């Protein structure tokens, strides 16, 4: 989709850091609550994300929930240059 590499990894962090997304289905919301972009961009990015793997989705009343797989946790190295397994999302953050 039409979004230069400062956008598709505008979040390459909220994904690996937080772990999941929420986005009520609203193209032209253009201001995601909890994230700095169009709400269109996250979903279309998550589309592009899920349709390659690394992340799943579920729908339940127009709220487009996303979740990522262990396949994600080694794809956030090719252009998401982070130290290998130095950290993850559902690891020791608040109670793990």
């Amino acid at each position: 989709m039409l979004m230069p590499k400062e956008d598709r990894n505008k979040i390459h962090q909220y994904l690996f850091q937080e772990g999941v997304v929420v986005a009520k289905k609203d193209f032209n919301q253009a201001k995601h609550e909890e994230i700095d972009t169009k709400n269109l961009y996250v979903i279309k990015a998550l589309q592009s994300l899920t349709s390659k793997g690394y992340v799943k989705t579920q729908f339940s009343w127009q709220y487009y929930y996303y979740t990522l797989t262990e396949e994600g946790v080694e794809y956030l190295r090719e252009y998401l240059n982070l130290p290998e397994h130095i950290v993850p999302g559902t690891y020791i953050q608040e109670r793990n």
């Binding site: 289905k25 032209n28 127009q62």
Partner: protein, 51 residues
């Protein structure tokens, strides 16, 4: 462009929170569910039938 979503409340703003449906919306107490969608999910929302 910026002429994309360049128009408005009324029916065009409201929709059932289950199907995106603009029509036949039940909004008394602000639940915002289709009459049809309401009658299915009404069992556990709190509305039982007595009389």
């Amino acid at each position: 462009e910026n002429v994309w979503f360049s128009h408005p409340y009324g029916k065009g703003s409201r929709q059932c929170r289950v199907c995106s449906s603009h029509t036949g919306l039940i909004r008394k107490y602000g639940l915002n569910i289709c009459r049809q969608c309401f009658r299915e999910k009404a069992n556990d929302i709190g509305f039982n039938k007595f009389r």
